[PDB]
Design a binder for this molecule. Structure first.
Ligand SMILES: NS(=O)(=O)c1ccc2ncsc2c1
Length: 182
């Protein structure tokens, strides 16, 4: 309906797939080549399903910062026969706050779902299901089950992936350009 949903849609239509692990279905964001991200609580193994295709996991890394604290991002390299459109130029380089964010989800249940979550705060520390976690973004939408992996964008930037909620707020792990240098 506006430039926010326009950018969100462009990212969803080319750079997402439906990942399925032993812990169910997830919005998975493809970043470049065969490299994608998913919440660490997805518990990626040796094998994953991508758009309902048995796919070997060539590598999987659950990111932590240099304080040895969880970031709740798992970077996955997929044994896929096709490369993602490279979107690393849409990743912010620094931790920051944002206005007018959209949280975008695509599953079998929730296809083509776009939520205007509004103002985003650099929240920082969060105790996420008992795990100390850093670089958390917070927004004031009562998000729900099946929205995890959801992509958070602003007009111009892909800023994080949805990793949880407390019924009043939602929380995203930051995506930083430095995570995907090669
Ligand atoms: N993205 S936008 O805000 O410029 C916009 C608004 C209304 C509209 N109606 C049809 S196409 C279209 C685009």
């Amino acid at each position: 309906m506006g430039p926010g949903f326009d950018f969100a849609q462009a990212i969803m239509k080319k750079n997402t797939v439906i990942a399925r692990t032993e812990k169910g279905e997830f919005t998975m964001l493809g970043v470049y080549d065969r490299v994608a991200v998913i919440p660490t609580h997805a518990s990626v193994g040796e094998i994953i399903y991508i758009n309902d295709v048995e796919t070997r996991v060539l590598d999987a890394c659950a990111l932590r910062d240099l304080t040895d604290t969880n970031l709740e991002i798992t970077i996955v390299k997929l044994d896929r026969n096709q490369k993602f459109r490279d979107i690393r130029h849409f990743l912010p380089r620094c931790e920051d706050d944002y206005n007018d964010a959209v949280l975008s989800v695509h599953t079998s249940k929730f296809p083509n779902m776009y939520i205007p979550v509004g103002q985003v705060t650099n929240y920082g520390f969060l105790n996420l299901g008992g795990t100390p976690t850093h670089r958390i973004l917070m927004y004031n939408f009562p998000t729900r089950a099946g929205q995890c992996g959801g992509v958070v964008t602003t007009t111009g930037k892909v800023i994080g992936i949805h990793v949880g909620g407390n019924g009043a707020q939602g929380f995203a792990a930051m995506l930083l350009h430095s995570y995907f240098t090669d």
